[PDB]
């Protein structure tokens with residue numbers, strides 16, 4: 291895909307008309323998604339690691355495509371899912387997420403920050419270590435019951451939020467755009483051969499939960515990390531889980 295480099299840490303790829311995968315490297319690359327709906331709306335699935343990077347994305351979208359009423363959906367509680375929530379909060383952008391995400395952020399958020407910082411103590415990681423210490427951890431503001439999921443419409447277009455079972459973290463959910471056959475899978479989907487960090491993972495249910503995603507009719511599937519968006523990401527994920 292053509293790559294728009296907003297800055298040194300931020301890349302944007304228009305993978306389908308009006309669907310943008312945002313890759314923020316901080317220092318690892320993590321993905322979020324902006325889908326423009328009509329002329330007035332936009333849905334943001336996940337955020338970049340930081341409020342400042344999230345602001346850069348919001349400003350770029352607004353300037354390129356007209357000011358949008360944004361809605362965000364957090365697909366987990368980690369810094370790569372919601373690290374930019376404060377940028378949304380200060381713009382009064384609704385942040386949708388599950389009650390499990392709220393509980394996990396409250397109970398595990400600071401502990402996970404320390405784990406993240408512990409990986410950034412080496413030479414060359416100084417600027418990331420510093421900012422990861424100070425990123426404000428802000429939870430969702432419009433909360434649904436995890437196992438119920440959530441269905442809503444934005445400008446007449448339906449959006450579906452589905453919990454398939456515990457995967458990478460007990461709260462991971464996927465977001466499906468039926469009118470576009472786009473599935474944001476997030477951190478439950480893997481590019482390459484590894485699982486990633488397993489501190490919060492349920493290795494007993496992860497594969498069977500991802501197998502449920504086979505029922506979505508997909509043209510594009512967004513994983514949490516990595517630049518690969520074909521629906522075969524789902525099978526790759528299944529192939530690497532036990």
Ligand SMILES: [Zn+2]
Nearest residue numbers: 368458459477
């Ligand atoms: Zn994670």
Ligand SMILES: [Zn+2]
Nearest residue numbers: 376379380426
């Ligand atoms: Zn704030």
Ligand SMILES: [Zn+2]
Nearest residue numbers: 370477514515
């Ligand atoms: Zn992740």
